[PDB]
Amino acid sequence: MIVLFVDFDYFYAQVEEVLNPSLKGKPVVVCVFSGRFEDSGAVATANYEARKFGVKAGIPIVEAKKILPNAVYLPMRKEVYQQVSSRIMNLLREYSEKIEIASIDEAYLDISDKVRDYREAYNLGLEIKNKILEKEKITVTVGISKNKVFAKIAADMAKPNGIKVIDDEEVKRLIRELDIADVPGIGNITAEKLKKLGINKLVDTLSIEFDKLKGMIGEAKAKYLISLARDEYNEPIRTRVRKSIGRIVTMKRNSRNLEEIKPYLFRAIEESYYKLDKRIPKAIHVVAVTEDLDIVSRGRTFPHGISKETAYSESVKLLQKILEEDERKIRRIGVRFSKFIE
DNA sequence: GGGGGAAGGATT
DNA sequence: GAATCCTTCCCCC
Ligand SMILES: Nc1ccn([C@H]2C[C@H](O)[C@@H](COP(=O)(O)OP(=O)(O)OP(=O)(O)O)O2)c(=O)n1
Ligand SMILES: *P(=O)(O)OC[C@@H]1CC[C@H](n2ccc(N)nc2=O)O1
Ligand SMILES: [Mg+2]
Ligand SMILES: [Mg+2]
């Protein structure tokens, strides 16, 4: 089994770059402006020029403008990015039908039946980068290894516009030396608590009693890390669809008033049914964000499809429940749709 | 005993 | 901040 993983370089910022020639060699920061106070919101993506001075995804915009005030700041245009992404993934499909589109900026190809060894895979990867650059002017990084996780790790390593093979000797070395925080699917909440116990490398995961590990990070992550350190991670490359679509918006202050909150909620529904195409969800969640970092939701699932008009009524009810079962005022309001037909 | 569903939590 | 996916828990056949 040979896996070829493809990840798009600083993707939202790079698409803005391709579109706007007046930008490339400068620092570029793609943001989501919550539209509240001036410069309210966060950084979604920054190019490498911007990253050098500390500005990266998830930091507050006002923070990015202190450590790098003169950069070019741009609002997120997710639909533009999604159009480009869709085109590149159709390019990817041509190299393998065994493809796992994991997110808007990355995918896994099972190229086992296509190539006989890592040398041929590396040439294939080069051909893939070349065609994506040619057709879309977008640089990508390719990872190649024996399974999905290590192929991504290879891409993580290959910096931007790179390509890298992690062979079998290399996985063994990586199991012992790679930081747990560098493992796909392991975020900082998980990395930090493990690190306090001295669990810093994948191999350490074997040194700790399974039951303690499961009590810390949960059964799934435990087994996941353990399977990695044991060099027996399986999981084939399979077709993936987006499971949920939704809209969450920030309100201009506001509070508890129903008829005040309702107009935002309604817009989020419009946008969510817009983005759903002709998918048809069976479940709906209304999500509100309180006056703190507190996120509260209420949902309902039906034995059938939810018509858009029906989305309206149910979503108000769900909101009524949130308002009734929580005293804090509401800052942001949204809706998520899931459990689609087929 | 194991879906399924709901509510909260974590990752990108 | 926004979008999405993951984790835990409850209940009933
Ligand atoms: N706190 C965070 C972390 C990440 N993201 C988004 C930004 C990224 O565009 C996207 C995917 O993460 P990537 O690490 O792949 O980021 P980039 O594609 O922008 O750059 P790179 O390819 O170097 O990873 O997740 C976000 O919105 N908020
Ligand atoms: P990123 O570094 O570009 O990685 C994206 C991947 C796609 C799926 C997966 N993912 C997404 C969202 C959540 N909550 N959990 C995940 O594991 O990361
Ligand atoms: Mg990327
Ligand atoms: Mg990515």
Coordinates of C-alpha atoms in Angstrom, one line a residue, chain A residues 69-340:
Chain A
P69 CA 0.2 46.3 11.3
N70 CA 1.0 47.0 7.7
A71 CA 0.1 43.6 6.1
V72 CA -2.6 43.3 3.5
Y73 CA -5.8 42.2 5.3
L74 CA -8.6 40.6 3.3
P75 CA -12.0 39.1 4.2
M76 CA -12.6 35.4 3.8
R77 CA -14.2 34.6 0.5
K78 CA -15.0 30.9 1.1
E79 CA -17.1 30.4 -2.0
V80 CA -14.2 31.5 -4.2
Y81 CA -11.9 29.1 -2.5
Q82 CA -14.4 26.3 -2.7
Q83 CA -14.8 26.7 -6.5
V84 CA -11.0 26.5 -7.0
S85 CA -10.8 23.5 -4.6
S86 CA -13.5 21.6 -6.5
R87 CA -11.6 22.0 -9.7
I88 CA -8.3 20.8 -8.2
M89 CA -10.0 17.7 -6.6
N90 CA -11.4 16.8 -10.1
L91 CA -7.8 17.0 -11.3
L92 CA -6.8 14.7 -8.4
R93 CA -9.5 12.2 -9.3
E94 CA -7.8 11.5 -12.6
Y95 CA -4.8 10.0 -10.9
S96 CA -6.8 7.6 -8.7
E97 CA -10.5 6.7 -8.3
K98 CA -9.5 5.7 -4.8
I99 CA -9.6 9.2 -3.4
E100 CA -10.5 10.6 0.0
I101 CA -11.3 14.3 0.0
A102 CA -10.7 15.2 3.6
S103 CA -11.3 19.0 3.5
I104 CA -11.4 21.9 1.2
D105 CA -7.6 21.9 1.0
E106 CA -6.5 18.3 1.1
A107 CA -7.1 14.8 -0.2
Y108 CA -5.8 11.2 0.0
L109 CA -5.0 9.1 -3.0
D110 CA -4.5 5.3 -2.8
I111 CA -2.0 4.9 -5.6
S112 CA -1.0 1.3 -4.8
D113 CA -2.3 -0.2 -8.1
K114 CA -0.9 2.8 -10.1
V115 CA 2.8 2.6 -9.1
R116 CA 5.0 -0.2 -8.0
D117 CA 7.4 1.7 -5.6
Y118 CA 8.2 5.0 -3.8
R119 CA 10.3 6.2 -6.7
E120 CA 7.4 5.9 -9.2
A121 CA 5.1 7.5 -6.6
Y122 CA 7.5 10.4 -6.3
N123 CA 7.4 11.0 -10.1
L124 CA 3.6 10.7 -9.9
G125 CA 3.6 13.3 -7.1
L126 CA 5.7 15.6 -9.2
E127 CA 3.4 15.2 -12.2
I128 CA 0.4 16.1 -9.9
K129 CA 2.1 19.2 -8.5
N130 CA 2.9 20.2 -12.1
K131 CA -0.6 19.9 -13.4
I132 CA -2.2 21.7 -10.5
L133 CA 0.3 24.6 -10.9
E134 CA -0.3 24.7 -14.6
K135 CA -4.1 24.7 -14.5
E136 CA -4.8 26.6 -11.3
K137 CA -1.5 28.4 -10.5
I138 CA -1.7 26.9 -7.0
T139 CA 1.3 25.3 -5.3
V140 CA 0.6 22.1 -3.3
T141 CA 2.7 19.9 -1.0
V142 CA 2.7 16.1 -1.5
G143 CA 3.2 13.5 1.1
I144 CA 3.9 9.9 0.3
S145 CA 4.1 7.0 2.8
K146 CA 2.5 3.6 3.7
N147 CA -0.7 5.0 5.3
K148 CA -2.8 8.2 5.5
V149 CA -1.4 9.5 8.7
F150 CA 2.3 9.3 7.7
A151 CA 1.6 10.6 4.2
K152 CA 0.2 13.8 5.8
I153 CA 3.1 14.0 8.2
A154 CA 5.4 13.9 5.2
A155 CA 3.5 16.8 3.6
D156 CA 3.6 18.7 7.0
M157 CA 7.3 18.2 6.8
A158 CA 7.8 19.2 3.1
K159 CA 7.2 22.9 3.9
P160 CA 5.4 24.7 1.1
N161 CA 5.6 23.6 -2.5
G162 CA 7.4 20.4 -1.5
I163 CA 7.2 16.7 -1.9
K164 CA 8.5 14.0 0.4
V165 CA 8.5 10.2 0.9
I166 CA 8.6 8.7 4.3
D167 CA 9.8 5.1 3.8
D168 CA 9.7 2.3 6.3
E169 CA 13.0 3.0 8.0
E170 CA 11.7 6.6 8.2
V171 CA 8.4 5.7 10.0
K172 CA 10.3 3.8 12.6
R173 CA 12.5 6.8 13.3
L174 CA 9.5 9.1 13.3
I175 CA 7.5 6.9 15.8
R176 CA 10.3 7.5 18.3
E177 CA 11.2 11.1 17.6
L178 CA 8.1 12.9 16.4
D179 CA 6.2 15.1 18.8
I180 CA 2.7 14.0 19.7
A181 CA 1.4 17.5 18.8
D182 CA 2.7 16.9 15.3
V183 CA 0.3 14.0 14.9
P184 CA -2.7 14.5 12.5
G185 CA -5.9 14.8 14.6
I186 CA -4.1 15.6 17.8
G187 CA -4.8 19.2 18.8
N188 CA -3.3 21.3 21.6
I189 CA -6.0 20.3 24.2
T190 CA -4.8 16.7 23.8
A191 CA -1.0 17.4 23.3
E192 CA -0.8 19.6 26.4
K193 CA -2.3 17.2 28.9
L194 CA -0.2 14.3 27.7
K195 CA 2.9 16.6 27.8
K196 CA 2.3 17.3 31.5
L197 CA 2.7 13.6 32.1
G198 CA 5.9 13.4 30.0
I199 CA 4.1 11.8 27.0
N200 CA 5.8 13.8 24.3
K201 CA 6.6 11.3 21.6
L202 CA 4.4 8.7 19.8
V203 CA 6.4 5.9 21.3
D204 CA 5.7 7.1 24.9
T205 CA 2.1 6.1 24.3
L206 CA 3.1 2.5 24.7
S207 CA 4.7 3.2 28.2
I208 CA 1.5 4.2 29.8
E209 CA -1.3 2.0 31.0
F210 CA -4.1 1.9 28.4
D211 CA -6.8 2.7 31.0
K212 CA -5.0 5.9 32.2
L213 CA -4.5 7.0 28.6
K214 CA -8.2 6.4 27.7
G215 CA -9.3 8.4 30.9
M216 CA -7.2 11.3 29.7
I217 CA -7.9 11.7 25.9
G218 CA -10.7 9.2 25.3
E219 CA -10.8 5.7 23.9
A220 CA -10.7 6.6 20.3
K221 CA -7.7 8.9 20.4
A222 CA -5.9 6.3 22.7
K223 CA -6.4 3.5 20.3
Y224 CA -5.5 5.8 17.4
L225 CA -2.1 6.9 18.9
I226 CA -1.4 3.3 20.1
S227 CA -2.0 1.9 16.7
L228 CA 0.4 4.5 15.3
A229 CA 3.3 3.9 17.8
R230 CA 2.9 0.2 17.1
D231 CA 3.3 0.8 13.3
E232 CA -0.1 -0.9 12.6
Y233 CA -2.4 1.9 11.6
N234 CA -4.8 0.5 9.1
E235 CA -7.9 2.5 7.8
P236 CA -8.2 2.4 4.0
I237 CA -8.7 5.4 1.8
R238 CA -12.5 5.8 1.4
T239 CA -14.9 8.3 -0.1
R240 CA -15.8 11.1 2.3
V241 CA -18.7 13.6 2.1
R242 CA -19.2 16.7 4.2
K243 CA -21.5 15.5 7.0
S244 CA -22.9 18.9 8.0
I245 CA -23.5 22.3 6.6
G246 CA -24.4 25.4 8.6
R247 CA -24.2 29.2 9.1
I248 CA -23.2 31.0 12.3
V249 CA -23.3 34.7 12.5
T250 CA -22.4 37.4 15.0
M251 CA -25.2 39.8 16.1
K252 CA -24.7 43.5 16.6
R253 CA -24.8 43.1 20.4
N254 CA -28.4 42.3 21.1
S255 CA -29.6 40.1 24.0
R256 CA -32.5 37.8 24.9
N257 CA -35.2 39.2 22.7
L258 CA -36.7 36.5 20.4
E259 CA -37.9 38.8 17.7
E260 CA -34.5 40.5 17.8
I261 CA -32.6 37.2 17.4
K262 CA -34.9 35.7 14.8
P263 CA -33.7 37.9 11.8
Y264 CA -30.1 36.6 12.1
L265 CA -31.2 33.0 12.6
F266 CA -33.3 33.3 9.5
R267 CA -30.4 34.6 7.4
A268 CA -28.2 31.7 8.6
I269 CA -31.0 29.4 7.4
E270 CA -31.1 31.0 4.0
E271 CA -27.4 30.7 3.5
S272 CA -27.4 27.1 4.9
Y273 CA -30.1 26.0 2.4
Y274 CA -28.2 27.9 -0.3
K275 CA -25.0 26.0 0.6
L276 CA -26.9 22.7 0.9
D277 CA -27.8 22.5 -2.8
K278 CA -30.3 19.7 -3.3
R279 CA -28.9 17.6 -0.4
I280 CA -31.8 17.5 2.0
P281 CA -31.0 17.2 5.7
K282 CA -32.9 15.2 8.3
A283 CA -31.5 16.9 11.3
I284 CA -31.2 20.5 12.4
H285 CA -29.3 22.2 15.2
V286 CA -29.7 25.8 16.4
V287 CA -26.4 27.0 18.0
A288 CA -25.9 30.0 20.1
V289 CA -22.9 31.5 21.5
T290 CA -23.4 33.3 24.9
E291 CA -21.9 36.4 26.4
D292 CA -18.9 34.3 27.3
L293 CA -16.9 31.7 25.4
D294 CA -19.9 29.5 26.2
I295 CA -21.5 27.6 23.3
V296 CA -25.0 26.2 23.6
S297 CA -27.1 24.2 21.1
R298 CA -30.4 22.4 20.8
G299 CA -31.3 20.1 18.0
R300 CA -34.0 18.0 16.5
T301 CA -33.9 15.1 14.1
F302 CA -36.9 13.9 11.9
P303 CA -37.7 10.6 10.2
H304 CA -37.7 12.6 6.9
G305 CA -36.3 15.6 5.0
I306 CA -36.6 19.1 6.4
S307 CA -38.1 21.5 4.0
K308 CA -36.7 25.1 4.1
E309 CA -40.0 26.5 5.4
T310 CA -40.0 23.8 8.0
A311 CA -36.5 24.7 9.0
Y312 CA -37.8 28.2 10.0
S313 CA -40.4 27.0 12.5
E314 CA -38.4 24.3 14.2
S315 CA -35.4 26.6 14.5
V316 CA -37.4 29.2 16.3
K317 CA -38.7 26.6 18.7
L318 CA -35.1 25.3 19.3
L319 CA -34.1 28.9 19.9
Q320 CA -36.9 29.3 22.4
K321 CA -35.5 26.4 24.3
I322 CA -32.0 27.9 24.4
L323 CA -33.5 31.2 25.6
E324 CA -35.5 29.3 28.3
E325 CA -32.7 27.1 29.5
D326 CA -30.0 29.7 29.7
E327 CA -29.9 33.1 31.3
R328 CA -26.8 34.6 29.6
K329 CA -27.5 36.9 26.6
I330 CA -26.7 35.6 23.1
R331 CA -23.9 37.0 21.0
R332 CA -23.8 34.8 18.0
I333 CA -26.6 32.7 16.5
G334 CA -26.6 29.9 14.0
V335 CA -28.0 26.7 12.5
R336 CA -26.4 23.5 11.4
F337 CA -27.9 20.9 9.0
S338 CA -26.9 17.3 9.0
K339 CA -28.0 13.7 8.5
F340 CA -28.7 14.2 4.8

